[PDB]
Design a protein around this ligand. Structure first.
Ligand code: EMC
Ligand code: EMC
Ligand code: EMC
Ligand code: EMC
Ligand SMILES: [Ca+2]
Lengths: 114, 114, 114, 114
C-alpha cells in the first residue's frame, strides 16, 4: 500500500544495528519481517491488527526454534559426558585389575611367604 | 466472530513455514494460538486489545518454559562434569599411591641400600 | 478502571495453563503482569498504548534475564571442562614419567646390557 | 512529541526492576528502547503503529542474538568435550600398551617357561 514507511523502517533498523543492510529488511522471507512489511503497507485497522497478530506469532515461533537448537546441543553434550564417564569407569576398573595382577606377579619374587 | 481471517492466517503461517499445517493453527490448544484466534474473531477493540494482551503474555510464558528446560539441562551437565572430575581425582590419587607401593616393592630387589 | 476483564483474563490464563492459579495473575509483582493489569484497567488509548509498550519491554527484559542465567551456567561448564582437561594433562604426563622410571628400574635386573 | 509519558515510563520501569535507573531508559541506544521512546512521543496512530512494529522486531532480534551467544558457547563446550574424550582414548590405549610391555618384561624373570 505504501513503501514510504517500509523505506524509513529499513533505514532505521539498519542505523540501529537491528539488521546489517536495508535490502535485508524488505525482500527477506523471514516470517517476522514479512508480517512487518505487510503491517507497514496496511491502510485499514483490520489488515494492521491481522498483520501485528502474525508478527507476534512469527516472533514467538522463530525464538522457539533457536531455543530448541540450543536444547538439542545440550542433549548431545549430556550424552557425550555420560558416555565419557562410563568409558572412564570401564578403564579405571581395568587398571585397578592390572595393578593387582602386577603386584601378585611381583609376589613370585619374594624370598619370604614361601 | 469471523473465520475468514482465521482461515487466511492459517494459510499464510503455513506458507511462511511458521506452522507445518493449517489445521494446526486453528484447533491447537496452545495459549498463544488460542489468543490469536480469539483476536482474529474479535469485532470490537475491547476484545481485540484483551486478546492481544493475552497473546503477548502467552508468548512470554511459553518462551520462558523453553528457556527453563535448557536451564535444567545445564544444571544436569554441570553436576555431571563435577561428579566426573571428583571420580577422576579419587582415581588419580589412588593411582599415585599404587605407583609408590610398586616402586617400594621393587626396592626389595636392590643389591645396594642393604 | 475495570476488574471485569482482569478477572476474565486471570481465569482464561489459568484454564490455558499459562499460570497455575488466578490469584497469581492479579497481585503478582512481575513487570509483565503489572503492565498487563494496567492495560486491562485502561479506558483510554493513551493509557492502553502506554501499558502495551511497557508490557513488551518487560517481556523482552525478563526473557533476556533467563537467557543470561543460561549463559552464566554455560561459562561455568566451559571453565570446568577446561580445568578438568588440564588436570588430566598434568596427570597423564606424570604417569608417562612414572612408566619410564619403572621400566628403567626394571632394567637393573637384566642379565644382559651389563 | 511528549516527554511526560516517557518520564513516567522511565520511573515505572525502574520501580518495577526492569531497568536499574531511569536515565538508562531514555538516552539508551538500545533498538527496543529507541522505538519505545519514539512510540511514547507519538501523537498519531501512523507513527505509533510504526514504532510498535519496530519495537517488536527489535525485541525479537536482541533475544535472537542472546540465544545465539549461548549457541556459540554450546558449540565450544561440545568440541571441548570431544577433544577431551579423544585425548583420553589415545592415553588409555597407550597405557594398556605400557601394561603389556611391563608384564612381558616381568616374564623374563620367571623360573619356568624357559
Ligand atoms: C492488534 C494486534 Hg493483533
Ligand atoms: C492492545 C494490545 Hg493489549
Ligand atoms: C500500542 C502499543 Hg505501545
Ligand atoms: C500496531 C503495532 Hg505495528
Ligand atoms: Ca538458551
Amino acid at each position: 500500500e505504501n513503501t514510504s514507511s517500509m523505506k524509513e523502517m529499513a533505514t532505521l533498523l539498519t542505523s540501529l544495528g537491528v539488521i546489517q543492510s536495508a535490502q535485508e529488511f524488505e525482500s527477506s522471507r523471514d516470517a517476522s519481517y514479512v508480517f512487518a512489511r505487510r503491517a507497514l503497507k496496511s491502510a485499514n485497522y483490520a489488515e494492521m491488527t491481522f498483520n501485528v497478530c502474525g508478527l507476534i506469532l512469527s516472533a514467538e515461533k522463530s525464538s522457539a526454534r533457536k531455543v530448541d537448537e540450543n536444547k538439542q546441543l545440550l542433549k548431545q553434550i549430556q550424552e557425550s559426558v555420560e558416555s565419557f564417564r562410563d568409558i572412564y569407569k570401564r578403564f579405571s576398573e581395568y587398571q585397578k585389575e592390572q595393578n593387582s595382577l602386577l603386584m601378585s606377579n611381583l609376589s613370585t619374587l619374594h624370598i619370604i611367604t614361601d
